[PDB]
Amino acid sequence: SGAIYVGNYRVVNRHLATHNDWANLVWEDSSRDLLVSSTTAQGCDTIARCDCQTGVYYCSSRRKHYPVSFSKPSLIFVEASEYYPARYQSHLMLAVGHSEPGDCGGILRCQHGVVGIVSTGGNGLVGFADVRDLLWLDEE
Ligand SMILES: CN1CC[C@@H](Oc2cccc(F)c2)C1=O
Numbered sequence: 001s002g003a004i005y006v007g008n009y010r011v012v013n014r015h016l017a018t019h020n021d022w023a024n025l026v027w028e029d030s031s032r033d034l035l036v037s038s039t040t041a042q043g044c045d046t047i048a049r050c051d052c053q054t055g056v057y058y059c060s061s062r063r064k065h066y067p068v069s070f071s072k073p074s075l076i077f078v079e080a081s082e083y084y085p086a087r088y089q090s091h092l093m094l095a096v097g098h099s100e101p102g103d104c105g106g107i108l109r110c111q112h113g114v115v116g117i118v119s120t121g122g123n124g125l126v127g128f129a130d131v132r133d134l135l136w137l138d139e140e
């Protein structure tokens, strides 16, 4: 689990989004596993505006933050699934690291702020859904 809170926005994994997330839908992308919902309480997170390829992510399944090198956001085919069709995901960044399904929503951050959230895992890779291209997350 886990979310980003910037301004009056909540960013979550689309597969983990609640009834309340969908009641207050701002934006979703099924190909990116991202959903943004509206919040009443102002969030204090800063979104990274950069092309860092290094940072730290939280891994709930190890209760540990790991420093990682990661790929630039790309279209990638993700093997295995759940209740979803083991398929393509856009704006996805891979690193070598530990990721289980419940690690989704773990934040990846550089010195500039929030880069993305854990979205995929397996084979000793962790996938992160990039949010840095969503410039509208920092205004009204
Ligand atoms: C996982 N999902 C998908 C829809 C969402 O709940 C809803 C359903 C209808 C109206 C609404 F405002 C929200 C939910 O729980």
Ligand SMILES: CN1CC[C@@H](Oc2cccc(F)c2)C1=O
Pocket: 015, 078, 080, 081, 082, 084, 099, 100, 101, 102, 103, 104, 118, 119, 120, 121, 122
């Ligand atoms: C659509 N979904 C839901 C979670 C993801 O599966 C995983 C599998 C392993 C690690 C991980 F972090 C995520 C997926 O394919």
Ligand SMILES: [Zn+2]
Pocket: 048, 049, 050, 051, 052, 110, 111, 112, 113
């Ligand atoms: Zn950065």
